Amino acid sequence: RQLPCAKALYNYEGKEPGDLKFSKGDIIILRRQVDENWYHGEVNGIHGFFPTNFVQIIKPL
């Protein structure tokens, strides 16, 4: 089956171990929605957290 996923609208990264780094246009697999403001997702087997408003959902969780 197709995994939940989203397209990055903007670049993101951070200095916390858990921040997911990505560029605008990247396709991110969604793994968990922490709260209204944060997802856990992954790109290329690298996991981390990022803001919900920085992506456009393709397939929801």
Author numbering: 134 to 194
Mind quoting what the paper says about this structure?
Aromatic residues cluster in the core of folded proteins, where they stabilize the structure through multiple interactions. NMR studies in the 1970s demonstrated that aromatic side chains can undergo ring flips—that is, 180° rotations of the χ2 dihedral angle (Cβ–Cγ axis)—even when engaged in stabilizing interactions in the hydrophobic core. Here we capture ring flipping events of a buried tyrosine residue in the SH3 domain of the JNK-interacting protein 1 (JIP1). Our data therefore suggest that the conformation of the aromatic ring at position 526 is determined by steric interactions dictated by the size of the surrounding amino acids.
